[PDB]
Amino acid sequence: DCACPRVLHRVCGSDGNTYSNPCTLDCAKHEGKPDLVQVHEGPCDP
């Protein structure tokens, strides 16, 4: 890990970054952002 499928399913992190899929979100959370959470599906607003 943090091993993610290579599907594009853009989500929005609580850090306001768009993640390419829930899994890469999950990875960023597990790598350096414990409080990182998915806010909603689709890209974040900039």
Partner: protein, 221 residues
Amino acid sequence: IVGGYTCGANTVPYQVSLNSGYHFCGGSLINSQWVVSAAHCYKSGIQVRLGEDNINVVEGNEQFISASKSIVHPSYNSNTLNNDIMLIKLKSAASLNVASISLPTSCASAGTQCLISGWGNTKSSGTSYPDVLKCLKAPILSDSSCKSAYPGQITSNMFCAGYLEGGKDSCQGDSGGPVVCSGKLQGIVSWGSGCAQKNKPGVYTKVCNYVSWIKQTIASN
């Protein structure tokens, strides 16, 4: 595709984009009615988009065809991504020549140079989603090096392709997409640890293991 290059229009005629409102996976046309893709690419209401280069601009000659059936491999494991293969049937047959890619009769060996394609992210660091189809020449990597890169995560239905050195890889958005080597669809973009990372090559579905099932599934659907 990170570290790749622009395929060119129509140069990957079997490359399809799976679209459910936005591009989300690739796929390979294997005959006019059928697409292979990753089973993790499964969605309801897939629209298959054929003859795409710029996914963002309707050139006017593409074919947008709804998936009529989307058949995941019945051993597909979403947790391990073993058997990450899905057959999509087109509501109507694609207009050819768009073209299908041959299925393997043999597996490819370590060292085989392949063509991997997709509209997935082109950046390791940030995000850069391309508009035109991107391509990557990459060799199939040895099993032992695949497995040492990904201990406990590699099954006989997986192979690694790319570069241990990093920098050249498939990426999110590339899933379902082709790895074609010597004129044969050998791989489906499946997964990896990030994209284009040192010692984390792309992991692909080993299509050669699924030729009998693809044939049985196509013949019976």
